[PDB]
Amino acid sequence: CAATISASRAPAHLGDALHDVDTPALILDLDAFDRNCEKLKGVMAGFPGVAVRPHAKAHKCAEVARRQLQLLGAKGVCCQKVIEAEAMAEGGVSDLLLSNEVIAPRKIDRLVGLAAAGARVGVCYEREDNLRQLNAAAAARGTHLDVLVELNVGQDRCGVNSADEVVQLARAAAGLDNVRFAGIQAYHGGLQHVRDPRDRAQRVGQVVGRARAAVDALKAAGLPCDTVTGGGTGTYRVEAASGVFTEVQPGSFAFSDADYARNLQEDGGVGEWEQSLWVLTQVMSVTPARGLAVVDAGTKAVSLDSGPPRLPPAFEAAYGTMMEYGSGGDEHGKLMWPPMSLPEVGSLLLLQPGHCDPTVNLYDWLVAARRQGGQQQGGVDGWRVEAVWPIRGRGPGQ
Amino acid sequence: RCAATISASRAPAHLGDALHDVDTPALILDLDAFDRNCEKLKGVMAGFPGVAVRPHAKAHKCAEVARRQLQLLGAKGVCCQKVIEAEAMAEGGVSDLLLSNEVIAPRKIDRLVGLAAAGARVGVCYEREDNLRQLNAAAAARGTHLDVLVELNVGQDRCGVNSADEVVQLARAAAGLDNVRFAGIQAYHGGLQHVRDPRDRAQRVGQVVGRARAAVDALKAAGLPCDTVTGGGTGTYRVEAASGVFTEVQPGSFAFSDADYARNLQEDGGVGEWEQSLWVLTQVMSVTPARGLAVVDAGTKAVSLDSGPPRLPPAFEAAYGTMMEYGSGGDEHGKLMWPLPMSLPEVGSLLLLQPGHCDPTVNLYDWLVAARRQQQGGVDGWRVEAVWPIRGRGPGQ
Numbered sequence: 001c002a003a004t005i006s007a008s009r010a011p012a013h014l015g016d017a018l019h020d021v022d023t024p025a026l027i028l029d030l031d032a033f034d035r036n037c038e039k040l041k042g043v044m045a046g047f048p049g050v051a052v053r054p055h056a057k058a059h060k061c062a063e064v065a066r067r068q069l070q071l072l073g074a075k076g077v078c079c080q081k082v083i084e085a086e087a088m089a090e091g092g093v094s095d096l097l098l099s100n101e102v103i104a105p106r107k108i109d110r111l112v113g114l115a116a117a118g119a120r121v122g123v124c125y126e127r128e129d130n131l132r133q134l135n136a137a138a139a140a141r142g143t144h145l146d147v148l149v150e151l152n153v154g155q156d157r158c159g160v161n162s163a164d165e166v167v168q169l170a171r172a173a174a175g176l177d178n179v180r181f182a183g184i185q186a187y188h189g190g191l192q193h194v195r196d197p198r199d200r201a202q203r204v205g206q207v208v209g210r211a212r213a214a215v216d217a218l219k220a221a222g223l224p225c226d227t228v229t230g231g232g233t234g235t236y237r238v239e240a241a242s243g244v245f246t247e248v249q250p251g252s253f254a255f256s257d258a259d260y261a262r263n264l265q266e267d268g269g270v271g272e273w274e275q276s277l278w279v280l281t282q283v284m285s286v287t288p289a290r291g292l293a294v295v296d297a298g299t300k301a302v303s304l305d306s307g308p309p310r311l312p313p314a315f316e317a318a319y320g321t322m323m324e325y326g327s328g329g330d331e332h333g334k335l336m337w338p339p340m341s342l343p344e345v346g347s348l349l350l351l352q353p354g355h356c357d358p359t360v361n362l363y364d365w366l367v368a369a370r371r372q373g374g375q376q377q378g379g380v381d382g383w384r385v386e387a388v389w390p391i392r393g394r395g396p397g398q
Numbered sequence: 399r400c401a402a403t404i405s406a407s408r409a410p411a412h413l414g415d416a417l418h419d420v421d422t423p424a425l426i427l428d429l430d431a432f433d434r435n436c437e438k439l440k441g442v443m444a445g446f447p448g449v450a451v452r453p454h455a456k457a458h459k460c461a462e463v464a465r466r467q468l469q470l471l472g473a474k475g476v477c478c479q480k481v482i483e484a485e486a487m488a489e490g491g492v493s494d495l496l497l498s499n500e501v502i503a504p505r506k507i508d509r510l511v512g513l514a515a516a517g518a519r520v521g522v523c524y525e526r527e528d529n530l531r532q533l534n535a536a537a538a539a540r541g542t543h544l545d546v547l548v549e550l551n552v553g554q555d556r557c558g559v560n561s562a563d564e565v566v567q568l569a570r571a572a573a574g575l576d577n578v579r580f581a582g583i584q585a586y587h588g589g590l591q592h593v594r595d596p597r598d599r600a601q602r603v604g605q606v607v608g609r610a611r612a613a614v615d616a617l618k619a620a621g622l623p624c625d626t627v628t629g630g631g632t633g634t635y636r637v638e639a640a641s642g643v644f645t646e647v648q649p650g651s652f653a654f655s656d657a658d659y660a661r662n663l664q665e666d667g668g669v670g671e672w673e674q675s676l677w678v679l680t681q682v683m684s685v686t687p688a689r690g691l692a693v694v695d696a697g698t699k700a701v702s703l704d705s706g707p708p709r710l711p712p713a714f715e716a717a718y719g720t721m722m723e724y725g726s727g728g729d730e731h732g733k734l735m736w737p738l739p740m741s742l743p744e745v746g747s748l749l750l751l752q753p754g755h756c757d758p759t760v761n762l763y764d765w766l767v768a769a770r771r772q773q774q775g776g777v778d779g780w781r782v783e784a785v786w787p788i789r790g791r792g793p794g795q
C-alpha cells in the first residue's frame with residue numbers, strides 16, 4: 001500500500017514505554033508540550049487583539065495542530081506548502097493560511113479544493129499573474145480565497161520591496177471576484193535566532209516600521225489592511241507589542257531545539273521554551289579506548305542543519321560528564337567525551353534536535369508520550385506512549 | 399488509510415509523463431546516465447578479477463534500483479546499513495544481503511533473521527561476543543543460518559575492533575556456534591572516500607590494506623579462514639580491488655554521483671569518475687531581479703546541505719549565460735543567487751539540481767522518478783519510464 005515500510009509500520013503503540021519504541025524515533029513529551037502552549041497563551045494575554053496562528057511546518061501533524069488550537073484558544077494554523085494544508089484539512093483543522101506563494105497550477109487546485117470543501121483559506125502573493133491564476137482556480141470551484149501581499153522586510157527571500165508595490169497588488173485584487181485582499185505578511189526569519197534581546201528588539205523595530213509604512217500607504221490609497229501577519233518563536237513578543245501586527249506565527253515554541261535554547265531574553269533566562277521534542281536513539285557500539293559511544297541515529301534520523309543535537313541534563317546525572325554528538329554518517333551518531341561510565345550498548349538516550357522542523361520531517365510517525373512529574377528532563381525511564389500519530393505532511397514540500 | 403504520510407500515499411508522477419508533469423520537488427533518476435555508471439564500474443572491475451562488487455543499497459533504498467544494478471553489473475548482492483533496507487530489498491526479490499553494520503536490538507535481529515528464514519542469504523557484521531550470541535540464538539529459533547563478519551576499525555574510528563587479536567577471538571567464538579558462520583571481515587574507511595588526488599588516495603588506502611591483511615594473516619596463523627574481505631566505497635574501490643587482499647568492494651554512490659564525488663581527481667586526469675544521474679527537480683516560485691535572485695520550491699526538506707550546496711548543471715549556464723549558486727532559504731525555499739548581462743529563470747520554470755550529497759537527499763523522498771532523455775541537465779526532452787517506491791526511506795530502523 002504505502003511507498004515506504006516506515007510509513008506503513010508504526011515504531012510503537014498505545015501503552016508502550018520508551019524501551020518498546022523502535023529506534024530511531026521521534027518523541028513528543030505532551031506534558032512539556034502542554035506547558036509551552038500554556039506559556040505562549042499567557043504571554044499573549046499581555047497583548048489583547050493579537051491572534052496566534054501556530055505554524056504547522058514544525059510538526060506536520062493534524063493531531064498536534066488540534067491540541068495546539070484547543071490549548072491556545074486559537075482558530076487556525078500556518079502551512080508552508082499545500083501538502084501541509086492538505087494534512088491539516090483532512091484532520092479537521094479548517095482555518096488555514098498558506099504563508100508562502102503557490103505558483104504551480106496543480107498545487108493551487110489542491111489548495112482551492114480545500115476551500116471548496118469548507119475550509120477557510122488564506123494564501124500569500126507577490127505577483128499579479130499569480131493573483132489572477134489564484135482567482136481563476138477559486139472561481140472554477142465556486143469558492144473564495146483570502147489573499148495577502150507578502151512584503152520583504154529584510155529577510156530577502158520572497159515578497160515585494162516597497163509600500164507602493166503592496167498598494168499596486170491590493171489595487172489588483174479589488175477587481176477580482178473570488179479573491180479578497182486581506183492584508184500583508186511581514187516575516188523576517190533572519191532575526192529569529194538573534195541572541196541579544198535588545199539587538200533582536202531593535203531589529204524587529206525596523207521590520208515593524210516597514211510593515212507600518214505598508215499599512216499607511218494602503219490607508220493613503222483608501223484601501224484597508226485587515227490582517228498584518230508575521231514573526232516567529234524568536235521575535236513574536238516584539239511584533240505583538242507593536243500595535244501594527246494583528247497576528248503572530250510562531251511554530252517552534254511548542255517543541256524548542258538547541259538553536260532556540262540559546263536565545264537570551266529580557267529577564268535572567270536563556271531559552272524561552274521547554275524541550276518537548278526528542279529523537280530516541282539506542283547505543284549500538286562502544287569503544288572505551290577512544291571517547292566513544294555510537295548511537296543508531298545518524299544524518300537520516302537527526303538533521304544537523306543548525307548544528308549537532310544535544311544530550312539533556314538527565315544524561316549528565318549518573319554518567320558524570322556531558323558528552324558531545326558528532327556525525328558518524330548516515331546511520332551512526334558519535335558520542336564523544338571531551339573518566340567515568342560510557343553508556344552501555346543497548347542503552348537508550350534522548351537527543352534534543354539542533355533544529356526542530358527538519359528533524360520532524362525525517363519521521364513518518366510521532367510518538368506522543370508522558371512520564372511520571374518532578375523529573376530531570378531527558379531520561380528514558382518511566383514513559384507511557386499516549387498516542388502514535390501519522391505525520392501526514394511529511395515530505396519534500398509538495 | 400494508505401500511508402502515515404500523504405507523500406508516501408501519492409506518487410509525484412506517472413508512466414509517460416514529461417518532467418513538466420512531475421509534482422515538485424521530486425527525485426529524478428536518469429536511467430541512461432545510471433546505466434552508463436553501472437557499465438563503467440563493471441568495465442573497471444573486469445581489470446580486477448576475483449573481486450566482487452556488492453553495491454551499497456543505502457544510497458538508493460529502492461528494490462527496483464538494486465535489481466537493475468545487479469543485472470547491469472552481473473553481481474549477486476547488495477549491502478544494507480540498517481535492517482529496514484534489508485527488508486525493502488528482500489520484499490523486492492533481492493535475496494543476497496550483507497548488513498554492513500552491527501545490529502543489537504532483538505526486534506531488529508528477528509526481522510533480519512526472518513529474511514534468512516524466508517530464503518534470503520544474509521550476512522551481518524559484529525564486534526562483540528554477546529551480540530554474536532544473540533545473532534546465533536535468533537537464527538537457531540527460526541531454523542536458519544547467518545554469515546557473520548568481524549568489523550575492524552581501519553582508520554575511520556567509527557565502529558569495529560582495533561586489533562587482530564580481537565578479530566581472532568570473535569572468529570573463534572563464531573567457529574563453535576551452530577547457526578552462525580565466520581565469513582571474514584569488513585574493513586571500511588569512510589574518511590578516505592573524498593580524498594581528492596589518486597596518489598593520496600592510494601597512499602592512505604594502502605595503509606588500510608596493511609591493517610586488513612594483518613587481520614587475515616593473524617586468522618591464518620590461528621588456523622581460521624578469512625573467506626571475505628569486504629570494504630571500500632565509490633572513492634577508494636580501485637585501490638581496494640587492486641590490493642589482492644580485498645575480495646569485495648562496497649561502492650554505493652557511484653551509480654548516482656553528487657557534487658562532492660564529482661571533485662575526486664582520477665588516474666586518467668579526469669575530475670569526477672561518474673556521470674550525475676540523480677537530480678532534485680525544482681520549480682522557481684519567486685524571482686527578484688537586482689537582488690539577482692530566483693527562489694525555488696526545494697529547501698532543506700528537499701535537498702540535504704550536509705556536505706555542501708546542490709549544484710546547477712552546465713545546461714543551466716548554456717541557457718541563462720552564467721551559473722547561479724544555491725543557498726539555503728530555510729525549510730521550503732532554495733535561494734539561487736548570481737555570483738554580466740542579467741538573465742534570471744522565469745517563475746514557473748523547471749530546474750535540475752545536483753545534490754551536494756546523494757544518500758541523505760535520496761532519503762528525503764518517498765518515490766523515485768525514473769526517466770530517460772531522448773538523444774548535461776535540461777528539463778526539456780524527458781519521459782518518465784517508472785515511478786518506484788523508496789521502500790527503505792526513513793530514520794534507519
Ligand SMILES: [Mg+2]
Nearest residue numbers: 252355356357
Ligand atoms: Mg525552523
Ligand SMILES: [Mg+2]
Nearest residue numbers: 651755756757
Ligand atoms: Mg554518502
